[PDB]
Amino acid sequence: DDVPPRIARAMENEEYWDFDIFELEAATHNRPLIYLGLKMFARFGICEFLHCSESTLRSWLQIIEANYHSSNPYHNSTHSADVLHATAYFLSKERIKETLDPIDEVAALIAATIHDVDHPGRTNSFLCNAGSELAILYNDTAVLESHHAALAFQLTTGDDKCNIFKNMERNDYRTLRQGIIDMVLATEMTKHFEHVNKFVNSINKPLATLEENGETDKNQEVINTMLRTPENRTLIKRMLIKCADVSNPCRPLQYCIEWAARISEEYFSQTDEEKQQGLPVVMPVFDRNTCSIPKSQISFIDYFITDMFDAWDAFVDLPDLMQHLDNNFKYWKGLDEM
């Protein structure tokens, strides 16, 4: 409640897409998730739904954010705060409110908070090839993604003060647990095109068929009934967490460049270690001695981001994000200068 002024000023216009997350990072001293989490959870009313105190929520945000590695350029507390901001923005849209339930809103915001907890600044492929403790523990199968969700519940339910899922019905927690686990696992790279294609085939293509008929009152209930099913709601949640996780190319110009620099620097750390130890180089293009950052972002946007956000835009309607995506794509093209 009694928040200091710079951090209060940093979280002024938080409902808007244009948001200075790096000012909040600098203001909070690499503790943006606890301050942004408290406001976002209070605005939606998470602890009113979950039945918990503010002290229970603060201890949960404290222990979670502590396990985020500050030494990592990209995968740190500030990334999850940005993903939590992206998640809350999509939940606030007219399409998502009428489609999803309050249990899904809570599942999304909690998942966004924990989705990269205890990230070692290294990919799944690095851990499997190196033979890391988690690679052996999870059998080279969603090594990081399973560790993020597992460790999050270990820290939450393990301690009594940190447990936000204390005063809940066994059925409500069981449903909410499965919802969070699914969204955290859906962020995995290998399952990208599977989750994108299912969103197009099961939601967008049927919805395009029904919208061609008209705006009839009976037709809206057919659209509502179809989208609100347990299967399609899960596919929307899978798509929402995936877009929110990689929303940095659809941000304002100065924020887009900063996120690109961090994730690039993180891959160069991995590439130097792989060459030193004598491991198989999984990302040869991302080497500090050879990598064009502008050209790499153009490759990244064309392969993954363009088609994903196109489908997501068709469903939700996101004029700000696609306008930023166009401006940032043209900016990287301008930096060639040859």
Ligand SMILES: Nc1nc(Cl)nc2c1ncn2Cc1cc(OCC(F)F)ccn1
């Ligand atoms: N601007 C970005 N560029 C690159 Cl090269 N990687 C990024 C970026 N922002 C997050 N990451 C991590 C990531 C994300 C990823 O997402 C696949 C799909 F969700 F986009 C696949 C592999 N690494």
Ligand SMILES: [Mg+2]
């Ligand atoms: Mg991850």
Ligand SMILES: [Zn+2]
């Ligand atoms: Zn992530």
